[model samples]
Target: RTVVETRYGRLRGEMNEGVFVWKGIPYAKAPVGERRFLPPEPPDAWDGVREATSFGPVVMQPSSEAPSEDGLYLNIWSPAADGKKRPVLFWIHGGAFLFGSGSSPWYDGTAFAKHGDVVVVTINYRMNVFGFLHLGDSFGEAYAQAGNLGILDQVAALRWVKENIAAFGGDPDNITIFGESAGAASVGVLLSLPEASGLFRRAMLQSGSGSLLLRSPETAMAMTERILDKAGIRPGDRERLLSIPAEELLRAALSLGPGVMYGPVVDGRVLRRHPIEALRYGAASGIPILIGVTKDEYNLFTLTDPSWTKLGEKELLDRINREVGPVPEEAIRYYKETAEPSAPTWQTWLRIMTYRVFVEGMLRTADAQAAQGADVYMYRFDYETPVLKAAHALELPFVFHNLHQPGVANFVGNRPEREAIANEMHYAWLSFARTGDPNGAHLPEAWPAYTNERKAAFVFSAASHVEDDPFGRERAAWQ
Candidate 1:
């Protein structure tokens, strides 16, 4: 057992494979009871060394398993407690703002701490209706920031890191925030938030962009009303709403179905404006950013949809035209031209949806950041697994270098080749965390900074290489 002193108290962390591991260190007080829907408050200080061995309770989520309101805790993996100032890589887990916890086995930071000589921290914040249900107008000023309490919880965690990470050998001034999907979106939102300023020097966004903010207050309130109606709670009855069991509230919230989205709202106080707009005008202009997406991000979503499997070519075109607006005939032609001749109709639809949902947004963000004179690196994960085929969130295990971890074999397949891909990608991430640049000896090719003229990107695959305007025709079709 090794002991480290945080601002709050002493913590005892165990060493795992040469890395000192600390699990479930509370960064903020649990948001329960009247504290529900309110910004997180600092955790009360403790006296003796707290056992930071097991992971803390995850936030109140609608899972059949592990669910709790007391989930604002963070986990850390450090190389040592020798009072050295190593760069900090703070991670936020992704679940589309609906579900996810830092305690996920896939996110173990042992590889990072051991290999990169960096301190890695992972955190769990509030999610879904509990974290994002907008109730400010109906409930009054006390709940103004209610819609963004999850983000505020993240801010509070970063604040804790800024004050306390040094004890774990992490440099307070050199933190890099990185995440995927909603977690990546959180990094983008944090870039625009004044409260998050100076907390981290760099950020990495994987498969998410700044454009994915919450719905407008009016739309969010309508959704909130529907949820309340489902819960049988009156409009002004804040007491009844607060008193509802976390599980019950989650059930009511999930009743709205999967299409209904919930996330950080532009509550004016917490988020001044849309993150894209802020980034356009130089918000977080000084921070270096590395952002990208996988080749088949929407493939994962389509695989589960029944309609995708049955659609014919003509039906696919009709659906795209009707639902996705007037897609140019040329764009359809371009997809047909590039796709495999024997590819299914859904492959074309998958490509279109992937570009629309993930690729385009990331491009716009990188362009906007570049426009603001920020150093931005862009890449695309084209590595194909037999099961997933470059699907969304597939890059995570590789990024964490946990391909050999349990349950990962199911997604990535039990292949030895994945190790080389993991080596390149994981070390590139570490290279970025250590310095602003992602190019390093581990990568097969030199990664250049993104520029509008070249549209250069490092494409990571079984054989990695740099490509200029890799999808120029498809992108031009959108324009």
Candidate 2:
């Protein structure tokens, strides 16, 4: 074990086996009491050694998990930096910008450090109220955290990595920022953010995109103020509310309801515009990119909806019509034919619709970026899981090669093929980090670069397939 001095403080991390693992290092000051809702400031320099043996308390976590106060921590794992300039992969964990921590056991970077020979950094940032809520009019700038504080936390961590990662034996210049789900979405937005420019040279997005913000800024702010009002914190008494316990603030934040989301806004500053808009206008032109979504990405949500399980084909069509606008009958007929809605199992229908929606979105994004002459590498994870299907976030553990972890039990079956595929996927991610291309000795397929006409993708499954325009039919349907 050794203690490294950072601009903020000294963190004691240890090397276990061949990997150096640093847990729970504070990257920013604690947002508590008077600091709540304020934009995060750098941590004050500490005098003594601070133990980084465990992850810090996750920031404003749900009661079921932890609280929000623990959100400023970070975890680092790397092959002994040894003065080697290994590419750095900074990961932002996904929890809808509301409920995840960088401390999840499944995000353990030791495996990646050992397998990929690169540095992996995962972060915890303020979530829910402390991270989201908009009270700019109420508390002035102190409580003006309307959009993208979580993303700001990520940027701060990257800056810290630029200065301090050398001590951990990782390269700062060869950084690749990647994430899954919400983390992926965050990466998408970062591609458009001015503050994030020059912070990373490569990007990878998995089953995530920036089109999914909560709503417009006005709507989000109005909704947030209502929730605070319901919590008995008037605009006039905003400072008093900050003094309340973090638990109370989180409870109040959740009371606003599920989908109580707060994401980036077209704030004309940090983020000049939405990720898609930015890409369309050459915001991400020069960056090398790898973007892809999983098969059956939305099945995880559809299966969890009790109403979806109970709906008949006709009723499901009615709901789809009501939600997706005019293409009701056409959409229904298409989904029924492709998904086999009349089959004994409803999961098949859910799988087809879910993956269809996801694949369509991916193709659209790739097509748009390709038109702009940006280099895009795309892939599809088709390897199905016996238990969970090829669901959302299913590719995470496999890509990271930590099939032995807990939640990953759903993704990994007891088969030799499973281990083989895991190795294949991990290598692809490492390959992209190394050269911006996801093909090498391990992958059998050519892994073509995305183009407006071909839009080729490398598929990972029991037998891998490299196909062009994989979702042409679905794209037509969506349009």
Candidate 3:
């Protein structure tokens, strides 16, 4: 057993041989009551040693439809504190920006730390309204906490790591940040954020792109006004809004959405612009990046639909027209041309086509970063499941080196070949963390740096393959 004093408290954590696991370390206090929707303040100091055995309750990302209320907490796993400088991998779990917790079993860093000989950290930040409610106009700087509290929470954790990770056998100066889905998007934005520039050396983004639409403070304020009206939160009666039950407040936030603004807003100080724009301006020039997406990136979005199988061509066309508007023909042409399907199979084509569009977008974003003379490597996760196909988030278990763990087998399924791929994927990540290059003893060919011309990317499947210029058709069509 070992204990370390943090700025907030003295936490005692257990050791497994050389590995240390510290769970439920509060990075920031719960943002309840008066602290709600405000930028995270430093947690107050505690006197006696605090036990850190189990993971903390994540900020409120209960479900897609429910409010995410978890505030700030972090988990750490590292090798023995032997005064050795090891690479640190900080993980930000994906939840579509609304639904996941660091406590999930698959997110356990023990395997990654032990197998890769690296320090691993996972953070839980405020999600949904508590993390990303934009109220810039209502109270200006006073209510500045409305948007990006989640990101601010992450920044606080990074600061904590810089100050305290040495005791955990981590070299704070050699940090690498990795995430999936919304967490990946957060990593994308942080690459451009001034305060986040030097905090991490390398970055990995799985199944996310920098091009996702972002809201500006002005737009966020407009959305907030709509939320206020819908919730009947009147001027000078802010206390009423604050006192509302967590569920009610989230319900009100959802009711006002053109789509909920649970992401970074272009607030002048924190976020300069949308991530794509920031990347274009060489915001992340010196950093090496590993950016990739899953084969069926959006499968989860359509999985619950019973209408998908039964809908006819005309109905599908109408649905596409109604949902995406004037771009119906564009959507049709793109799908038909790429998926090479008959009119009757438009639904299948649509699903495959949409997923490709999102996936290719990530590739292009990596291409753009590479064009700026930064080291960028790209990949595509092609491992498919019997139920979900090659769905979103399938790469998580493989990267963490824990495929047989509960909840993970459900997504990746139980198979011998898939098991081999998990080892391959985990080793690739570990190699990257060790030297900023993913190629190593296990991989077949040397995975090349992503360039716009050749576009080499490692495709991870039951067996991993290296493809040169993947997404040729999708790229030509989208452009």
Instruction: List residue ranges in candidate 1 displaced over 4 A.
Output: 311-330, 386-391, 410-414
Query: On residues 268-311, what C-alpha lDDT tens digit does candidate 1 reach at each position?
Result: 86888988788888888888999989778776776546576678
Candidate 3's C-alpha runs over 4 A off are 16-18, 63-70, 216-226, 254-261, 305-334, 340-344, 347-357, 386-391, 411-414
Q: List the residue pairs that clash in candidate 1.
A: none
TM-score of the candidate numbered 2? Answer: 0.91
Per-residue CA lDDT of candidate 2, range 191-249, in tens?
Answer: 77777788888888888776644346676777777777667787758656767777776
Q: Is candidate 1 or candidate 3 better by lDDT?
A: 1
The reply for model 2, stretches above 4 Å from the true place, is 64-66, 267-269, 312-314, 321-333, 341-357, 386-391, 410-413
Error of 1 at 126 (Å): 0.3
User: lDDT of candidate 1?
Assistant: 0.85
Alpha-carbon shift of residue 180 in model 2 (angstroms): 0.7
Per-residue lDDT, model 1, residue 233, is: 87
The CA lDDT of each predicted structure is 0.85, 0.73, 0.74
Cα lDDT tens digits, model 3, 1-479, are 47876667788888765689898888776788888877777777889999987677666643422234544778899876545788999998777566677767889898989998899999888776667777764654667656777788888888888878877788988899998877788788788778887898999988776544356787677776777777777854668757877877667776754355457788765676777677778888888899888775554555645465467877765665564334434545866665534534744555544544366457656866897898898998887754422225668877887666686655543577776887788988998888899988678667888887888888887667889887766555545
Clashes of each: 0, 12, 8
Question: Which candidate gets the maximum TM-score versus the true structure?
Answer: 1
